[PDB]
Ligand binder design. Structure first.
Ligand SMILES: CN(CCOc1ccc(C[C@@H]2SC(=O)NC2=O)cc1)c1ccccn1
Length: 271
C-alpha cells in the first residue's frame, strides 16, 4: 500500500536525521561491532577474557579499594560504569530526536529515567554474539561462559541479556533500523509521572510510522519484522524488571554492595 508522497519523503528524512545523530552519539555502532566480532575489521583483535587468568591479563592489556574487591564485584562495577557512560550517550541522542528538547524538561528527564535501561540492553545486543560481549569500546571481549562462572549471586546477571540478544540479533537489524527503534522506546507516553502525554504520543506516532516504512524498505525478506519489534519493546521492559529483582536479591545477601549514585537515582521508582 506504500506510496511516494510528501508524507513518506518526510518519514525518510526523519529516518536519515535519526541515523546521522545516532552515528554522532554512539562511537561503537553495530556495523563496527559486527566487523570486530567477525574479524573482518582491519583493527587489532580485542583482548579476549575467557577465564580468571585472561581477566587479570586483560586488566593490564585493556586501556582506591575497588581493585582490592573480588573479581565478580570488579566486573559488576565495570558494568555499572559502562551504564553511566551509556546514559550520557543516550541523553545526547535523545536531544537530537525532533521535538524532544521542546518537551517539558521534567518529561525529558522522566523519559530518560524509564527508557535508558531498555536502550542499554537493546544496544548491548549489538556488541554480543553467542560466545560473548565486546567491552571497553571494542578493546576487549568477555565470554558468556566466563560471566556464568562468577560466584552466586553474580553468575546469572548477564544470562537474560544474552538470551534476549541471540533472538534480537536473528532479526538482523542495522544501525539505520536501531536509530528509529531506540527513538520510539524513548518517546513512550506511558512512563510514570509525565506531565504532558499527548505531545510525547504525537512524536512516537510519527517515529512508529518512520520505523514501519524503514523496515518495509530495508527488510524485503520479512513482513513480520515491525510486529516482532513491538513485542521486543515489551520484552525489554521485562528484562529491566528482572534486573531490578536481581539487584534486590544481590542487596539482601551482599549488603556491602556499592551502587553508583546516578544509577541509584534512576533505579529509585524503577519496577
Ligand atoms: C559485561 N560487560 C559489558 C557491559 O555489560 C553490561 C551489563 C549490564 C549493564 C547494566 C548495569 S549493571 C546494573 O546493575 N545496572 C546497570 O545499569 C551494563 C553493561 C562488561 C564487563 C566488565 C566491564 C565492562 N563491561
Amino acid at each position: 500500500s506504500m506510496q511516494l508522497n510528501p508524507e513518506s519523503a518526510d518519514l525518510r528524512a526523519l529516518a536519515k536525521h535519526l541515523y546521522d545523530s545516532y552515528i554522532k552519539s554512539f562511537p561503537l555502532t553495530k556495523a563496527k561491532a559486527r566487523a570486530i566480532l567477525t574479524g573482518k575489521t582491519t583493527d587489532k583483535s580485542p583482548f579476549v577474557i575467557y577465564d580468571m587468568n585472561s581477566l587479570m591479563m586483560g586488566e593490564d592489556k585493556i586501556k582506591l579499594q575497588e581493585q582490592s574487591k573480588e573479581v565478580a564485584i570488579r566486573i559488576f562495577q565495570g558494568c555499572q560504569f559502562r551504564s553511566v557512560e551509556a546514559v550520557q550517550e543516550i541523553t545526547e541522542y535523545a536531544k537530537s530526536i525532533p521535538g524532544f528538547v521542546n518537551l517539558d524538561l521534567n518529561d525529558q528527564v522522566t523519559l530518560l529515567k524509564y527508557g535508558v535501561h531498555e536502550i542499554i540492553y537493546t544496544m548491548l545486543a549489538s556488541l554480543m554474539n553467542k560466545d560473548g560481549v565486546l567491552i571497553s569500546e571494542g578493546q576487549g571481549f568477555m565470554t558468556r561462559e566466563f560471566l556464568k562462572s562468577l560466584r552466586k549471586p553474580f553468575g546469572d546477571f548477564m544470562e537474560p541479556k544474552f538470551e534476549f540478544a541471540v533472538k534480537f540479533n536473528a532479526l538482523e537489524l542495522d544501525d539505520s533500523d536501531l536509530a528509529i527503534f531506540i527513538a520510539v522506546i524513548i518517546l513512550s507516553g506511558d512512563r510514570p509521572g509525565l506531565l504532558n502525554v499527548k505531545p510525547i504520543e504525537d512524536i512516537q506516532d510519527n517515529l512508529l510510522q518512520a520505523l514501519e516504512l524503514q523496515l518495509k524498505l530495508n527488510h524485503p525478506e520479512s513482513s513480520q519484522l515491525f510486529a516482532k519489534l513491538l513485542q521486543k519493546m515489551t520484552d525489554l521492559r521485562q528484562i529491566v524488571t528482572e534486573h531490578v529483582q536481581l539487584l534486590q536479591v544481590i542487596k539482601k545477601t551482599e549488603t556491602d554492595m556499592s551502587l553508583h549514585p546516578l544509577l541509584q537515582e534512576i533505579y529509585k521508582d524503577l519496577y
